[PDB]
Amino acid sequence: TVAYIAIGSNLASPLEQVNAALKALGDIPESHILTVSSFYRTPPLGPQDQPDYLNAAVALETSLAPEELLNHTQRIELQQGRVRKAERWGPATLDLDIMLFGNEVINTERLTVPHYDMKNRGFMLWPLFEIAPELVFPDGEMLRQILHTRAFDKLNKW
Template sequence: MKTVYIALGSNLNTPIEQLNQALVALTQLPDSTLSAVSSFYQSRPLGPQDQPDYVNAVACLQTELAPLALLDALQHIENTQGRVRLRRWGERTLDLDILLYDELILQSERLTLPHYDMKNREFVIVPLYEIAPQLVLPDGEKLTDLAARFADHQMKILKK
């Protein structure tokens, strides 16, 4: 089994419920087990500020699915929950991003691993640190060091 970390985010159509539904869908993936979920955090939008705040979390999945098969499955979950991409970094019903897939480093048209900008996002690093504080990224960087950069984050915990 591979250890995979997935970022979840929503700011439309009852975001907490969207994340809860996505977590249920993750438990139903073939050859996979949901092993940990962070608290839910309220965060300001990364992109345009004329949209609602987000609810974010990170989940840990143990899976036998190959990276692109997992990506397809996550996109299916997004689409099932009504995902529409209106604008870059804009509002969305559900966003599921693969952050890390074991120690894999991958650059393809469809998928970049580790996630290309995860180190700069408090709404990723803080919940990831909550569930995997001893994690070391494939480049050797300790999650502890990244989390220290976001010690003064302004996110609000909505659900533990």
């Protein structure tokens, strides 16, 4: 099944953090990276001297169940994020989100698919449109139309 994963990081030097996260993604069992988007840049809110976020989307072929894939994205966040030596929330983070899983709709306590806010986030939708321009969401919404009708922040490549 094709899953779409969002990767986000404002950690350290973020290019190498996202490349590491990509490698770990491809190391997930029964799962294969099909395509990766360009890398995009999201500035922080505020005027404050804070690191920019690097955003990407990945198409991952997987024979795992969605909750299994979740286990693996949660593990990588821990193993590759600054949770142990810092905090869960901590301004600085590595985020791995399952945006889409096949045409599945999953509404459970530990997993909601499609990701609950992705239609509102340019930094998820634009990279996704780069690698899947003909995508249609499980509810029948066309990705191309959402991009013509919702207001997103300007989003430059990294």
